[PDB]
Paper text:
During image analysis, we noted additional particles that could not be attributed to octameric STCs. Further investigation through iterative sub-classification revealed multiple interacting STCs, the structure of which was independently refined to ∼4 Å resolution. Rigid body docking supported positioning of up to three STCs, one on either side of a central nucleating complex, primarily held together through interactions mediated by flanking NTD-CCD dimers, tDNAs and CCDs, and adjacent CCDs.
Integration into host target DNA (tDNA), a hallmark of retroviral replication, is mediated by the intasome, a multimer of integrase (IN) assembled on viral DNA (vDNA) ends. Integration is mediated by the viral integrase (IN) protein, which catalyzes sequential 3′-processing and strand transfer reactions. Retroviral INs are composed of three canonical structural domains: an α-helical N-terminal domain (NTD), the catalytic core domain (CCD, which adopts an RNase H-like fold and harbors the enzyme active site), and the C-terminal domain (CTD, featuring an SH3-like β-barrel fold). Simiispumaviruses, typified by PFV, as well as δ-retroviruses that include human lymphotropic virus 1 (HTLV-1), employ four IN molecules, while α-retroviruses and β-retroviruses, the latter of which include mouse mammary tumor virus (MMTV), use eight.
Author numbering:
A (entry chain F): 1 to 41, 55 to 144, 154 to 209, 217 to 264
B (entry chain E): 1 to 265
C (entry chain A): 1 to 264
D (entry chain B): 214 to 265
E (entry chain C): 217 to 264
F (entry chain D): 217 to 265
The structure:
Amino acid sequence: ALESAQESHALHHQNAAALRFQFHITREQAREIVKLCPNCPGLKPRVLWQMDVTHVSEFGKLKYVHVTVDTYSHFTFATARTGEATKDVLQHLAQSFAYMGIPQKIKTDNAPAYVSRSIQEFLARWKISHVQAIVERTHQNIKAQLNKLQKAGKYYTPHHLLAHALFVLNHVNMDNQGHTAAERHWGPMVMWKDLLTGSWKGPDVLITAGRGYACVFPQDAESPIWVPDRFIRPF
Amino acid sequence: ALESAQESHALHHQNAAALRFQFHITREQAREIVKLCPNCPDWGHAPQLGVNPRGLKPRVLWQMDVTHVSEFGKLKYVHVTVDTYSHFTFATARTGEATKDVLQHLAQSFAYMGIPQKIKTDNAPAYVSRSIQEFLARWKISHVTGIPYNPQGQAIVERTHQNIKAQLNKLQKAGKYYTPHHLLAHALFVLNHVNMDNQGHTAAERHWGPISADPKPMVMWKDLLTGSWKGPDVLITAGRGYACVFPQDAESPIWVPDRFIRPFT
Amino acid sequence: ALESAQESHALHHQNAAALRFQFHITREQAREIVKLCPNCPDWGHAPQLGVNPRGLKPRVLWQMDVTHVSEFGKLKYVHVTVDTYSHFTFATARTGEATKDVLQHLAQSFAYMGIPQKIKTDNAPAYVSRSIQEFLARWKISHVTGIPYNPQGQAIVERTHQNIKAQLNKLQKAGKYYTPHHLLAHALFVLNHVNMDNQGHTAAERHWGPISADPKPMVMWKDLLTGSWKGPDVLITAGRGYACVFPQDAESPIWVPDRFIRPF
Amino acid sequence: DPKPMVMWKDLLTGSWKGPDVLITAGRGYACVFPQDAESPIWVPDRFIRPFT
Amino acid sequence: PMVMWKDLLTGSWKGPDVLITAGRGYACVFPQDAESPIWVPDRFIRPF
Amino acid sequence: PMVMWKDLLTGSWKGPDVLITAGRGYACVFPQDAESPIWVPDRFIRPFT
DNA sequence: AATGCCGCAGTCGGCCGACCTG
DNA sequence: CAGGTCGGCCGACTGCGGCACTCGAGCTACTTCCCTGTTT
DNA sequence: AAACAGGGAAGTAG
DNA sequence: AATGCCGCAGTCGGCCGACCTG
DNA sequence: CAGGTCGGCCGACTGCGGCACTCGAGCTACTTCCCTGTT
DNA sequence: AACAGGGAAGTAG
Ligand SMILES: [Zn+2]
């Protein structure tokens, strides 16, 4: 079972909690798997976001990367651009809004593009107000994730590898509490007994039950499975 | 007397009603006499038989196909992917058509949505290449090739094409946008976070919020594989032309058209 | 708050439900807001409006058009003449198509069916040629031209084309026939006399003979041209999508789609 | 003929023209259908006389 | 013709005024706003 | 009488335009850019504004 | 200067008489 | 045995749809397979 | 001389 | 190698508060 | 005045058609038009 | 100046 975690970390390089909640692996085993990796060592969502731009030398010409992260949910996004002009920030704003949604107000830096009238009028049209420890932390996180994923040098363009790393951070990199960045950002489970292995697996969402048969719905399984009430356990 | 009607059709190809009123036989006999004649035409007007299956969770079953928005010019090749549960849609105007474009769209959409258990698409040469096959294998995601020349197989993503084209034309008439990517991003934002259903629920929050289900009705069901009305069984989902019955003894849920669903109490 | 919805639609072009459940407005208000934007696309999937008239007496109103039966060879042009009351059909295999050929087909149809009060066809060059116009004037037969590119105004003869094509294909697969005229005559015979209706009445004796006059119902009627439900009145004929209402105060019978007739 | 075919008084010439076949009647008017006429016409019952 | 029409944008009943034409269940009513006529469904039209 | 209509030849929509008269399934619309009014079936008539 | 028509076939559902059973 | 029941029976209604003047050419992408010059 | 690499044609599908 | 779909928009109707009234 | 009625409002329902990889060329046929040739 | 080929032009199928 740990081999699946081996390929999972090789292709994604997630934190230990992610693997432990993905394959039900022991915490110490997850730590050992992470160590085996050679190059891998607000109150309401969508209210206030942070805007800043950071540069990465590996891109060369595409280091000009706008990044948007939430104050509360810490959901992350990035864009590969050739510059930091007004139109670049505008396009990044639009694409980030499509990715994530619309916050109440936005906190930015004092760059000339941020202060320019284009961004001001664009935000005014969208009914959002305009105003770095969190964003610089994410900059470290994304750059670390960029380096971790750079092992498999098969990505054709920086967009591909950037999207994969952002996916890892958003949906694969998962916290201690048992929720991904996506689940936290977007806001009766019954214990189920497997019959292939005879072990109780869950918790899983319940669909319905009747005539001694329970339609227990596994999280990983794509389709419902009908199981007798003898193999169910209230939770 | 019936055989006399038989050579009557063999000579003439009369219709059912004239057979009934000229040979004093029942309507069913005339209909089957018409059916039996080899020269009698084949019925192209078939009622609703096949239903395109849908996943029962977000990130389970996806559909993918290419289209053509000639306005973008060199960015006419638009790849789109719609989740079959929450109707969550995504697209990026990428020039050309090759395995590279499909892989890039896959990565970007994966980041956009998440991991679906399996993906179904059309039989375009890109979707059948080896490289994409081992790509899905290394990502541990099942692939379904689909039936050739059958757009109804991807009817869901074709309706998604309709929605995308409508929204793009609307926002293009609305004003002017810097880059085709900007217009596509705004259209996707509107569709997936603003263009919400009559139930007061956006597609995104359904794709990423808790699934809610009231006690589902117990309805009589007709099975195509036996020709008998067997039930009653729990009905998972229903709509306009799709219904997901699931008996206790069934391995996987059965998807049937709405014409074969009957209320039960 | 409606203004907020106004600029919201102007910026995003949303749907009605989002406006209704975000700005707390009436569903009617949301539909009006989505209607009022000129940049919003016009409704293309419109419901059915307009019904082809059909003379309630046989040999009153006819339809006519051409087709292309490619298997006839040089005789591939088929002229089709069909009644409206009884759907009696006639056809000929005339090589090419000209005013002389159209005139020959007219004479053959007159011999085969009779003299109609008026004929309504497409805007084909033959049917706009003057020669046919003064021929009809000499025979005292009115003419109707129709809107160009609009076969929907000749849907009756189009459906007759469908029927004739199906029958001729069936007969062609049935056996071997000497000449295309012979096969067309056999198909027309089948369609006119043998291919009987669903009410025990062959098309031939529907074309001629006594009119069936059942006690007509007293139904309620919606006036399309005034937007008011006015009635009840007399329902002359009915079928799949078409109806005929002839109120006392109206000079001529009215052709409306069936959905606007609500039984009383 | 199972249906009656009644005499009709035309109003254009004020002369009894017909007789013609009747379709329906009511409210003092009758849906009398002249054979030559292409469409039915509404005529007051005072101007319609039974014919046999 | 003097008729009643519903200001369905505001939900109220404004009028009376002239009615121009009809068709498609729509009455091209002309209010006191002489700028341009408007269109309203016949269901929200009342003769007066 | 400000009316949206469809050019039935190509299907591309031209308008808005002015309505001269209409009745019983047909509409007679006379756009300013055309020298003669256009008769159109009432299937392609929309009430612009 | 004039408008979507309708056959092929499935399908509901009442009607009716042979037949089960009170 | 007659009231109740199921079946034979058909009026009655509906979903799909091509009739429109006829037709193609050509695109790009991928794989399999065969052909001709290159290597040991 | 047997092996091998573009190169091409061809077939299928959108 | 694994099956038509649904948004736009009109329309029916049940719900319910205001208004008519025995 | 609360029973009686009416209008506002929305769940529920439904006819339609085009998303399908892209658009076009071409022939027949009568009439209106004036060039090129002849009164 | 004139009309009568006639080729074009336009238009609908
Ligand atoms: Zn790692």
